[PDB]
Amino acid sequence: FRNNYDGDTVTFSPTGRLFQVEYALEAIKQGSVTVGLRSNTHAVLVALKRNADELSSYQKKIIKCDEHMGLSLAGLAPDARVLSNYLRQQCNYSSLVFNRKLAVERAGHLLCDKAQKNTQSYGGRPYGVGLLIIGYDKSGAHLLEFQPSGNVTELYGTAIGARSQGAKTYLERTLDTFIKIDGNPDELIKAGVEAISQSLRDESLTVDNLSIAIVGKDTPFTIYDGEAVAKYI
Amino acid sequence: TQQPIVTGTSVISMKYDNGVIIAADNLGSYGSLLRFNGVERLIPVGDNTVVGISGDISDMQHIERLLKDLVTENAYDNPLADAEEALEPSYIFEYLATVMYQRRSKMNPLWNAIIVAGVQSNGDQFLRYVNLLGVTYSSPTLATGFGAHMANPLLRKVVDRESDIPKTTVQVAEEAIVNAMRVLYYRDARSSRNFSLAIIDKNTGLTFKKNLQVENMKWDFAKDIKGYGTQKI
């Protein structure tokens, strides 16, 4: 059954499924966990970095797109580099041509359309990465979940990757609490650190293991690593 | 490389305490022939911006079509098209300024001089100039063609610098504009008596006035003038 319709992305299955897209989604579940959450003033990304050996460095998960926008990756890092680079150019185009900060909602639409073109033509493959885009525009704080299928959803809180259901159940339960954390960045970080810890199983989050990013009302998108995330451990 | 065929003369403008005033006459000149009299040269974009164009009319109609497409494009996938993510005067100008510079760089320019007048979302007055060369500049008073030589000196008597802006009311600012239109009708050979006037205010919004005429003209002194030197009768 499955063997005959998974040769390339262009082929539909008898049930109407796209297995190449489904296998690309499986690359996210194999990837490391990352958590996104927001309130009315700030938006926070918390990511768990993965190393190959104890002699290897921890691969970065968060990429800055603009002064008001950024995203965290789960899956293939080169595919995240391509999609983030495109989003960097789209933010750059809006600022140079229109003197306008790109809306986070419109940024999700642009990522949706670029991922879609890989699923309808022959020779192409779907992107093997899930992205969690945070940003602050003219309508406030935003959080968007990107999927290789093209589906982009605006959420208060979400988590993607391995064991990400534990973090997703936490945010769904703590929904009314972290939404009201306004004008206090540190407490929103702690809500995300407690969220990502619900996904832990192999090890505990350490100094060079944790990666946190924040963007808000009077806060540009900045990434904290190593010593800067030690106070949240 | 081209030449202007159907032309529109001066577009004059100034900023007062609460907003901006822009005006242009209703003429479409064919060289020395004053061919068309029902030409609107002030293009309102939304309810917060008015775009005044001088020079080539065929190029003006192209710009007019581009502005209408910008409104249609901005409303696509945008639930806040009439609120937070509405078209600002700064976005409209920067788009035109990019187009005007790209066209001259391709050696095929839009033969125009454009002044974008409007009020930003925060309440700030917007008044910036762009021409066929792509040259951009802001000033308390802005005028194209003959208005730069004649209307600017008159309008600068009311507002000489940035500190004079909050001192000038709507009544005084409009009076200076109407007087400038009378002076331009006196000395510009490519001018019309009929003109349009637009007021963009942070409180009362956009007020578009049509079919305004130059009134209270001084001509009585002509009967006493006879000959060119020695003639007495």
UniProtKB/Swiss-Prot annotation, chain A:
Subcellular location: Cytoplasm; Nucleus
Assembly description: The 26S proteasome consists of a 20S proteasome core and two 19S regulatory subunits. The 20S proteasome core is composed of 28 subunits that are arranged in four stacked rings, resulting in a barrel-shaped structure. The two end rings are each formed by seven alpha subunits, and the two central rings are each formed by seven beta subunits. The catalytic chamber with the active sites is on the inside of the barrel.
Any single GO CC term annotated in Swiss-Prot or TrEMBL for this entry: proteasome storage granule
Chief site of localization: cytoplasm
Miscellaneous comment text of the record: Present with 7210 molecules/cell in log phase SD medium.
Gene (name only): PRE5
Phosphoserine modified-residue sites: 13
BP term (GO), one: proteasome-mediated ubiquitin-dependent protein catabolic process
Function: The proteasome degrades poly-ubiquitinated proteins in the cytoplasm and in the nucleus. It is essential for the regulated turnover of proteins and for the removal of misfolded proteins. The proteasome is a multicatalytic proteinase complex that is characterized by its ability to cleave peptides with Arg, Phe, Tyr, Leu, and Glu adjacent to the leaving group at neutral or slightly basic pH. It has an ATP-dependent proteolytic activity.
Source species: Saccharomyces cerevisiae (strain ATCC 204508 / S288c)
Keyword Nucleus annotated: yes
Name of this chain's protein: Proteasome subunit alpha type-6
Cross-link (Glycyl lysine isopeptide (Lys-Gly) (interchain with G-Cter in ubiquitin)): 190
From Swiss-Prot, chain B:
One GO cellular component term: proteasome storage granule
The keyword Nucleus is assigned to this record: yes
GO biological process, one term: proteasomal ubiquitin-independent protein catabolic process
SUPFAM superfamilies linked: N-terminal nucleophile aminohydrolases (Ntn hydrolases)
UniProt KW keywords: Cytoplasm, Nucleus, Proteasome
Family: Belongs to the peptidase T1B family.
Entry function: Non-catalytic component of the proteasome which degrades poly-ubiquitinated proteins in the cytoplasm and in the nucleus. It is essential for the regulated turnover of proteins and for the removal of misfolded proteins. The proteasome is a multicatalytic proteinase complex that is characterized by its ability to cleave peptides with Arg, Phe, Tyr, Leu, and Glu adjacent to the leaving group at neutral or slightly basic pH. It has an ATP-dependent proteolytic activity. PRE3 and PRE4 are necessary for the peptidyl-glutamyl-peptide-hydrolyzing activity.
Keyword Cytoplasm carried by entry: yes
InterPro entries the record matches: Ntn_hydrolases_N, Proteasome_beta4, Proteasome_bsu_CS, Proteasome_sua/b, Proteasome_suB-type
Protein name: Proteasome subunit beta type-7
Organism: Saccharomyces cerevisiae (strain ATCC 204508 / S288c)
Any matching Pfam family: Proteasome
Subunit comment: The 26S proteasome consists of a 20S proteasome core and two 19S regulatory subunits. The 20S proteasome core is composed of 28 subunits that are arranged in four stacked rings, resulting in a barrel-shaped structure. The two end rings are each formed by seven alpha subunits, and the two central rings are each formed by seven beta subunits. The catalytic chamber with the active sites is on the inside of the barrel. Interacts with CIC1.
